[PDB]
Amino acid sequence: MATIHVDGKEYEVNGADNLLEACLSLGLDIPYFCWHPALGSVGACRQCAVKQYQNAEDTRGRLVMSCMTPASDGTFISIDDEEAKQFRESVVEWLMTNHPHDCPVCEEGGNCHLQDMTVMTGHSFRRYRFTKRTHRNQDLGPFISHEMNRCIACYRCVRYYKDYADGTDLGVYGAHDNVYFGRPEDGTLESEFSGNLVEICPTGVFTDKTHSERYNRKWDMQFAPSI
Amino acid sequence: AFELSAAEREAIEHEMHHYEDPRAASIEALKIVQKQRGWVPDGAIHAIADVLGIPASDVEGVATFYSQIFRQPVGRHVIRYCDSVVCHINGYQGIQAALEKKLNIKPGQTTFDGRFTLLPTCCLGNCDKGPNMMIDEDTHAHLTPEAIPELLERYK
Amino acid sequence: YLPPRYRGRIVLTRDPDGEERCVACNLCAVACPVGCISLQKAETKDGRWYPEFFRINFSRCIFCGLCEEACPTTAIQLTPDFEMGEYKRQDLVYEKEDLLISGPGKYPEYNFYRMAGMAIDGKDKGEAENEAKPIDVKSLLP
Amino acid sequence: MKNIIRTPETHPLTWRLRDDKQPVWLDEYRSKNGYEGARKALTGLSPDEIVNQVKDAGLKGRGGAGFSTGLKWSLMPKDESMNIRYLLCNADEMEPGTYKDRLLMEQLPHLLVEGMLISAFALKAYRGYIFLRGEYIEAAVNLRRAIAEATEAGLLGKNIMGTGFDFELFVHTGAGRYICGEETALINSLEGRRANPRSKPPFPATSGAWGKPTCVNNVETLCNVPAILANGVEWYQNISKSKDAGTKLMGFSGRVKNPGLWELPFGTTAREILEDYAGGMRDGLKFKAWQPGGAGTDFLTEAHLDLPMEFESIGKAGSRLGTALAMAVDHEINMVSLVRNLEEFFARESCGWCTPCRDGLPWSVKILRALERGEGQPGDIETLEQLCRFLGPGKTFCAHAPGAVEPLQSAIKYFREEFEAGIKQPFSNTHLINGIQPNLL
Ligand SMILES: Cc1cc2nc3c(=O)[nH]c(=O)nc-3n(C[C@H](O)[C@H](O)[C@H](O)COP(=O)(O)O)c2cc1C
Ligand code: SF4
Ligand code: SF4
Ligand code: SF4
Ligand code: SF4
Ligand code: SF4
Numbered sequence: 007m008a009t010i011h012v013d014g015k016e017y018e019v020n021g022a023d024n025l026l027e028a029c030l031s032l033g034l035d036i037p038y039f040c041w042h043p044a045l046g047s048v049g050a051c052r053q054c055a056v057k058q059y060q061n062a063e064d065t066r067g068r069l070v071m072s073c074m075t076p077a078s079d080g081t082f083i084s085i086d087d088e089e090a091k092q093f094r095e096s097v098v099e100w101l102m103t104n105h106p107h108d109c110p111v112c113e114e115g116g117n118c119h120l121q122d123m124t125v126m127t128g129h130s131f132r133r134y135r136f137t138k139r140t141h142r143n144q145d146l147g148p149f150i151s152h153e154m155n156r157c158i159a160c161y162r163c164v165r166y167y168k169d170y171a172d173g174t175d176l177g178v179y180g181a182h183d184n185v186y187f188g189r190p191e192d193g194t195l196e197s198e199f200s201g202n203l204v205e206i207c208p209t210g211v212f213t214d215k216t217h218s219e220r221y222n223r224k225w226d227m228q229f230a231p232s233i
Numbered sequence: 234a235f236e237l238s239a240a241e242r243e244a245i246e247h248e249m250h251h252y253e254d255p256r257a258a259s260i261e262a263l264k265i266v267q268k269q270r271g272w273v274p275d276g277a278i279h280a281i282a283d284v285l286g287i288p289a290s291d292v293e294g295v296a297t298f299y300s301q302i303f304r305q306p307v308g309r310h311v312i313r314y315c316d317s318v319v320c321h322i323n324g325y326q327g328i329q330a331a332l333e334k335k336l337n338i339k340p341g342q343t344t345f346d347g348r349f350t351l352l353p354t355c356c357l358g359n360c361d362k363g364p365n366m367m368i369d370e371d372t373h374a375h376l377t378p379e380a381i382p383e384l385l386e387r388y389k
Numbered sequence: 390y391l392p393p394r395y396r397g398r399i400v401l402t403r404d405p406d407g408e409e410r411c412v413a414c415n416l417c418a419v420a421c422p423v424g425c426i427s428l429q430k431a432e433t434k435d436g437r438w439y440p441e442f443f444r445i446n447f448s449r450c451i452f453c454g455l456c457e458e459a460c461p462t463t464a465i466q467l468t469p470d471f472e473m474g475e476y477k478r479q480d481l482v483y484e485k486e487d488l489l490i491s492g493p494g495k496y497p498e499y500n501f502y503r504m505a506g507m508a509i510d511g512k513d514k515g516e517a518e519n520e521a522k523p524i525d526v527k528s529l530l531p
Numbered sequence: 532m533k534n535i536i537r538t539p540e541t542h543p544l545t546w547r548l549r550d551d552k553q554p555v556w557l558d559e560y561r562s563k564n565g566y567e568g569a570r571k572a573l574t575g576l577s578p579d580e581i582v583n584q585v586k587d588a589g590l591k592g593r594g595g596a597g598f599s600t601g602l603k604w605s606l607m608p609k610d611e612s613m614n615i616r617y618l619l620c621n622a623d624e625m626e627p628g629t630y631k632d633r634l635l636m637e638q639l640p641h642l643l644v645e646g647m648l649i650s651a652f653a654l655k656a657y658r659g660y661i662f663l664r665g666e667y668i669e670a671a672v673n674l675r676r677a678i679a680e681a682t683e684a685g686l687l688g689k690n691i692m693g694t695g696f697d698f699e700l701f702v703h704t705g706a707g708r709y710i711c712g713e714e715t716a717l718i719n720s721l722e723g724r725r726a727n728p729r730s731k732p733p734f735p736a737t738s739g740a741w742g743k744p745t746c747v748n749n750v751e752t753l754c755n756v757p758a759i760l761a762n763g764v765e766w767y768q769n770i771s772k773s774k775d776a777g778t779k780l781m782g783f784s785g786r787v788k789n790p791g792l793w794e795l796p797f798g799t800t801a802r803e804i805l806e807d808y809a810g811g812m813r814d815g816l817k818f819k820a821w822q823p824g825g826a827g828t829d830f831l832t833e834a835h836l837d838l839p840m841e842f843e844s845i846g847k848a849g850s851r852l853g854t855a856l857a858m859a860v861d862h863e864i865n866m867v868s869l870v871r872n873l874e875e876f877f878a879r880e881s882c883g884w885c886t887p888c889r890d891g892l893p894w895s896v897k898i899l900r901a902l903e904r905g906e907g908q909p910g911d912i913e914t915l916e917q918l919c920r921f922l923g924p925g926k927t928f929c930a931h932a933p934g935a936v937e938p939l940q941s942a943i944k945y946f947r948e949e950f951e952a953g954i955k956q957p958f959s960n961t962h963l964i965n966g967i968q969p970n971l972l
């Protein structure tokens with residue numbers, strides 16, 4: 007349908023798709039947080055940044071977001087561009103400024119999308135020396151535990167719960183760097199599809215409470231396909 | 234034990250006529266309730282939500298987002314002093330220091346009797362006319378630290 | 390005479406406040422090449438992760454020290470003591486009561502929970518290192 | 532200077548202003564050619580002809596970007612099934628150093644009403660909303676009185692002046708966030724939502740308020756529209772012999788002799804505003820730096836005066852013209868403290884949607900607080916440089932963050948010595964652990 011040029015190579019992709027879902031289908035690793043295949047693209051986390059050129063001869067282009075950019079015919083992009091790589095590392099660095107030192111006692115550990123993207127960008131050295139922001143937690147019922155300190159403000163939880171699942175009791179509160187995702191007050195999440203939040207949230211804010219009674223890491227699990 | 238009063242309720246439904254959606258009246262509904270009571274209490278979030286026909290998490294999201302809508306109890310008179318860049322050049326820090334001596338509080342805190350609450354605010358749009366502050370709906374310009382006690386006396 | 394870095398008997402150490410240092414994160418078990426560590430996480434009413442059981446099969450252990458270097462709490466350490474011997478191989482299987490010693494061992498001062506954001510007794514939110522106080526969304530200050 | 536011959540020809544915006552600084556009502560407004568613009572539009576001209584006239588005149592937006600008003604008005608659909616259209620008037624004015632719209636709504640309220648009336652007929656919008664800030668108390672009193680004054684003279688409501696046009700105007704006060712002045716975030720605030728901006732494309736001309744065609748215009752942009760139609764497209768073009776047409780509300784604020792606001796044509800140089808209108812600096816103060824158009828603009832020096840106040844002339848000098856309301860910085864303001872105040876405002880006014888604004892800007896604030904106190908470390912200034920590069924246009928979701936770093940990058944470029952004075956402590960972000968030898972760089 008459409009042909010795009012990525013990092014010198016040439017590929018055939020669907021024109022209706024955006025550049026993140028085109029390139030992930032070809033096996034090109036682009037980091038991302040706020041995009042979901044079911045939920046669509048909003049452009050919040052700015053992690054999916056690639057350098058886009060106007061044509062084959064344009065040497066200096068601009069950084070766009072691949073989840074928000076259509077894969078039109080004639081597209082010239084570079085994932086491995088140095089300025090794109092530095093910016094993608096910086097987005098992880100900005101998310102790491104307020105993240106708690108919680109991975110040994112986090113139930114998302116070993117199954118954490120934030121852990122995977124941090125390694126994938128190659129950010130391993132801390133420069134930030136100032137204080138971290140903290141949040142108190144809510145009670146969300148017998149199924150889902152709440153730890154707002156681990157939130158990276160990707161907005162996936164509210165987009166799933168209100169837009170997709172049509173739940174009414176989860177929203178975003180506050181402003182600037184004090185944004186809080188949760189309920190207006192403590193209490194059980196009313197939706198019959200609340201438990202998909204543990205897979206939808208890329209961090210360990212929403213985790214399975216029934217699994218945290220008898221916790222084990224993902225590598226120690228024995229799995230089978232079942233119904 | 235919050236109940237929407239019969240005049241607050243009529244004021245909210247008056248402004249639902251001026252929009253396609255009743256969701257658009259949510260900001261004014263919060264200001265209507267706050268004008269009568271000083272601040273928006275916790276039971277007013279569900280009260281406004283059921284009148285407008287939108288969920289309470291949407292109402293609470295709006296109220297926490299907007300700075301002037303208050304979700305904590307304030308004093309009888311709110312003092313809002315400008316701390317932006319043009320007021321910084323004209324000497325707001327001397328006004329802030331004079332406000333912290335007459336009231337013996339810090340910004341974000343109310344007075345012990347509850348007469349005044351002290352809050353910083355953005356640029357009031359009166360930049361050419363000096364350091365600026367607001368007490369309720371009244372704007373005072375050309376502020377000096379000596380003028381601070383006499384100005385406060387008017388608001389009892 | 391043994392040097393300080395000698396790789397003999399494996400112990401689990403304690404905090405300077407006196408609690409066990411292991412948070413049952415299972416990194417030592419997975420990093421072991423021989424697969425000689427089994428453990429299960431338990432959690433107190435305070436909310437502190439701790440191991441329900443800790444089991445090392447010393448018949449299989451090669452004393453490589455990969456478990457010690459994997460540990461993000463300094464709980465598991467290798468001590469200068471080679472004095473081991475048994476009549477039964479079943480007695481080479483050590484439980485947590487055979488491994489947990491009374492003090493902090495090689496690293497006298499490190500406490501992991503002081504770093505961690507997670508809230509336990511004695512450390513509410515904002516009482517950790519480089520952590521500010523929690524600000525509510527309902528706060529009057531913008 | 533204090534005597535200015537305000538004429539209908541050279542001061543269309545401000546010549547009706549009274550000397551006692553009191554507002555002008557519909558009886559007084561109509562004696563000095565008031566609503567005559569909207570008579571020539573509604574009774575004699577088509578909606579398309581008015582849009583081309585505003586395009587031919589060369590009217591640019593006064594909100595701080597300077598896009599063409601007639602081109603933006605031509606982005607609307609030509610479909611006849613899209614019957615519900617809205618006109619929104621941006622009366623937010625939350626940028627520091629911006630006090631221009633306060634003059635126009637408090638003392639000349641019918642000027643905005645007439646300007647919105649003509650613009651609504653051209654854009655075919657049945658409803659108009661004035662998005663006023665809630666701090667402007669006397670603006671809301673005078674606007675709501677002037678609307679009800681015009682509703683009984685038949686200039687608003689249904690069958691305005693005998694034509695088929697029916698337009699209903701509203702004033703709704705804001706709840707106090709600076710990002711509500713962003714035009715897509717104004718639409719979300721009007722809808723009763725958290726004021727996040729929207730991604731463009733699509734544009735609000737096709738999909739705006741409640742998924743309807745919408746046009747958002749600044750107060751001062753709308754006030755130019757009655758002058759154009761009443762006098763003619765040729766008068767407006769020949770006011771100044773410059774690439775920017777019409778008159779602008781230009782001013783100087785700060786520690787100057789006569790802070791204020793004067794209507795001036797484009798191409799007036801900044802030194803003329805500072806030394807003839809504003810009376811220069813106060814006695815015992817030297818001139819250090821100036822921001823041309825509010826808080827979001829890059830700083831400029833004394834060498835950058837004698838340079839005209841146009842969009843591309845300030846653009847080639849490394850800055851943006853913005854609101855055209857300039858702020859003077861004298862020799863007694865420490866530049867690091869001035870920037871720290873600026874970034875504190877910008878950080879706390881972030882809507883929180885996108886990562887490099889929500890998390891990048893608080894890091895800049897904390898570094899500047901360290902620099903101001905003297906606790907800055909040697910890697911701090913190179914971090915501020917990196918933040919400015921990565922918060923530029925297209926990297927964040929809206930233009931808030933690019934406007935935030937524009938004072939920061941100019942102040943490092945022109946005043947690096949005061950930023951370098953903050954660096955008095957070495958680099959250490961880690962504490963020693965007994966029994967563990969560190970990795971020594
Ligand atoms: C952060 C931000 C704040 C803004 N604030 C205002 C404002 O207060 N008033 C205004 O007229 N435009 C403001 N704008 C510009 C608007 O987004 C928009 O460009 C303008 O209202 C267009 O109208 P105009 O063509 O008449 O200039 C702001 C833009 C940004 C990015
Ligand atoms: S959410 Fe991921 S990165 Fe954060 S503490 Fe848990 S495992 Fe670590
Ligand atoms: S709670 Fe989880 S899903 Fe929701 S914004 Fe935070 S990190 Fe994203
Ligand atoms: S000994 Fe260390 S690595 Fe092993 S489970 Fe305990 S804390 Fe984790
Ligand atoms: S020393 Fe090596 S073999 Fe022994 S328990 Fe530790 S990792 Fe396993
Ligand atoms: S830059 Fe991003 S976070 Fe800042 S105001 Fe714009 S959308 Fe919100």
Ligand code: FES
Pocket residue numbers: 037038039040041048049050051052053054071072073074
């Ligand atoms: S994944 Fe594309 S901007 Fe978030």
Ligand code: FES
Pocket residue numbers: 315316317318319320321355356357358359360361364365627628629
């Ligand atoms: S900066 Fe103080 S009112 Fe504008």
